[PDB]
Design a protein around this ligand. Structure first.
Ligand code: BOG
Ligand code: BOG
Ligand code: BOG
Ligand code: BOG
Ligand code: BOG
Ligand code: LEU
Ligand code: BR
Ligand code: BR
Ligand code: BR
Ligand code: BR
Ligand code: BR
Ligand code: BR
Ligand code: NA
Ligand code: NA
Length: 501
């Protein structure tokens, strides 16, 4: 007795909503520009074929396998694949990663809502040609919303509107998640994914019509899709690319796995998986990449775009792009569409990374969905205060959980499933129910190329990448405590298990 996806389409759209989020529209544009445009597009594609696709199939398999036995989370699932105590411990990262990521992700997701509400109502800055005179009012606007430190103190000071909108955002996440898999996440995916797509396509079209003295949107596209084989030898290009592949595909977050545990034992994962991965890549390389960069390039030429890209993650999407839109007509409504697009793109993703925790409390602590959802909401809402109030706390969570964490966790889930659990049993399991079959070549990729590929990166990472403030220790301290709290629950679960047995 376990919730299941009602419909094939509902399932595919929920898994595409999982993947397609603030990642395709905020991160991808920046990552692609920072690393030389078309330069970044070669390693990004190979990373999709050698890491994204195999890992996407592996996670679906693991999740579906688990769900057939009533287990949607990695501490349970890892233990099934590998009957070892250390399998439960390693499996804890599959609750910790999505949880930590959720803590800052839902906060950023709320900004987009707040901005949308202000653009719609026209409570946005009125810029007075001087590039800085147009950018400044918007930089000031975001800065008041999140409360960027004016002094030396590493202290943020969210506006009350910002803060209340985070309550509303949390409330909307819960109101979906509390309704469950089919009547909440699946009903929501069916509405949001179309809406999202139509919004994107409209903004893409509206952006190609941009032409100024400094360029056109067509300039931005060229920059984006013009090879530069002289970066290929840079580790920093491939790192960025692979890293992007993880975040973007939601790989390593334990989220694909949990969603898959609601797929019926017999249902197909091979085609379904490949479709959701492909929908993601389309959504970023066609939609996400054709908005921010072309628009900045049209207004500032190329050099200045890359300069803005390098500036910050949130500069382009929260300051530059709205500043640009303010300089075209029906621009304020253009910004509304942009933030309303980001909000739906974050909302369908944030409910995905909150579900592993909910699934754990329901599956292992036998909690009711209503309680599992409220308690998880409590933990996320509470811990998020660290992200709202402590400068660079978001950066530190993003680093350990959403950067290092997911890669190490991708490699871990593959070794366990495909080496420890057994490469052939893995392969069999992946293909069972399959409408199509995984191409035979991917058996060797999955077993040798993929884990190798990752192991190499993960080494160059720990080696080539003390120079931080002391407040980083407040965040690290707290997220280590989160890991222990989760280990403790895993402990409590295996015990209730010993007694129910
Ligand atoms: C006899 C059943 C087969 C063994 C696997 C079922 C239990 C999975 O294993 C354990 O279950 C706990 C919940 O019960 C999880 O929270 C633990 O993390 C996991 O250790
Ligand atoms: C459950 C966790 C609560 C811990 C303390 C939270 C205090 C937040 O409180 C609110 O923060 C806002 C944002 O700046 C302010 O605008 C409000 O005036 C303030 O009351
Ligand atoms: C979707 C509804 C959101 C309601 C939140 C409103 C937050 C109130 O915030 C207040 O708004 C005033 C007017 O702008 C300001 O002048 C106040 O200083 C500010 O604290
Ligand atoms: C060392 C022994 C560990 C005991 C801690 C138990 C964890 C509490 O957990 C509870 O256990 C119950 C019993 O089945 C379940 O019915 C509840 O739903 C569950 O939340
Ligand atoms: C470790 C994370 C800390 C979260 C607790 C934040 C406590 C906020 O506290 C309140 O915040 C308001 C908004 O800036 C201020 O106006 C109040 O003076 C302040 O007391
Ligand atoms: C944390 C994940 C849900 C992130 C999502 N894959 C995105 O790119 O936004
Ligand atoms: Br992407
Ligand atoms: Br970024
Ligand atoms: Br504000
Ligand atoms: Br200080
Ligand atoms: Br307008
Ligand atoms: Br309960
Ligand atoms: Na999404
Ligand atoms: Na994505």
């Amino acid at each position: 007795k376990r919730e299941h996806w009602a419909t094939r389409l509902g399932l595919i759209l929920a898994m595409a909503g999982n993947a397609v989020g603030l990642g395709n529209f905020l991160r991808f544009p920046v990552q692609a520009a920072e690393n030389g445009g078309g330069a970044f597009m070669i390693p990004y594609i190979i990373a999709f074929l050698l890491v994204g696709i195999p890992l996407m199939w592996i996670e679906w398999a693991m999740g579906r396998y688990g769900g057939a036995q009533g287990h949607g989370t990695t501490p349970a699932i890892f233990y099934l694949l590998w009957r070892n105590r250390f399998a439960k411990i390693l499996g804890v990262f599959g609750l910790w990663i999505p949880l930590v990521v959720a803590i800052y992700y839902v906060y950023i997701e709320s900004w987009t809502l707040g901005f949308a509400i202000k653009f719609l109502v026209g409570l946005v800055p009125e810029p007075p040609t001087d590039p800085d005179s147009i950018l400044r009012p918007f930089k000031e606007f975001l800065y008041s919303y999140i409360g960027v430190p004016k002094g030396d103190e590493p202290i943020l000071k969210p506006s009350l509107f910002a803060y209340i909108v985070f309550l509303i955002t949390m409330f909307i996440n819960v109101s979906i998640l509390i309704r469950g898999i089919s009547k909440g996440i699946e009903r929501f995916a069916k509405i949001a994914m179309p809406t999202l797509f139509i919004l994107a396509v409209f903004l893409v079209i509206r952006v190609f019509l941009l032409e100024t003295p400094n360029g056109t949107a067509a300039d931005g596209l060229n920059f984006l899709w013009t090879p530069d084989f002289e970066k290929l030898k840079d580790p920093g290009v491939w790192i960025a690319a692979v890293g992007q592949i993880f975040f973007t595909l939601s790989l390593g977050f334990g989220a694909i796995i949990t969603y898959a545990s609601y797929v019926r034992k017999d249902q197909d994962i091979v085609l379904s998986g490949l479709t959701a991965a492909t929908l993601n890549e389309k959504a970023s390389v066609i939609l996400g990449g054709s908005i921010s960069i072309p628009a900045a390039v049209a207004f500032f030429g190329v050099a200045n775009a890359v300069a803005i890209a390098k500036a910050g993650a949130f500069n382009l999407g929260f300051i530059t792009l709205p500043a640009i839109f303010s300089q075209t007509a029906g621009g304020t409504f253009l910004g509304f569409l942009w933030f309303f697009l980001l909000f739906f793109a974050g909302l369908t993703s944030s409910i995905a990374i909150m579900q592993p925790m909910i699934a754990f409390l329901e599956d292992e602590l036998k909690l009711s969905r209503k309680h599992a959802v409220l308690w998880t909401a409590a933990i996320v809402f509470f811990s998020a205060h660290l992200v709202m109030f402590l400068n660079k706390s978001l950066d530190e969570m993003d680093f350990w959980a959403g950067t290092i964490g997911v890669v190490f966790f991708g490699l871990t889930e593959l070794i366990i499933f495909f080496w420890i659990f057994g490469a052939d049993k893995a392969w069999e399991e992946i293909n069972r129910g399959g409408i199509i079959k995984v191409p035979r070549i991917y058996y060797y990729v999955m077993r040798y190329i993929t884990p190798a590929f990752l192991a190499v990166l993960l080494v160059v990472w720990a080696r080539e990448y003390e120079e931080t403030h002391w407040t980083v220790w407040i965040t690290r301290f707290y997220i280590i405590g989160l890991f222990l709290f989760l280990t403790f629950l895993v402990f409590l679960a295996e015990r209730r298990r010993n007694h129910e047995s």
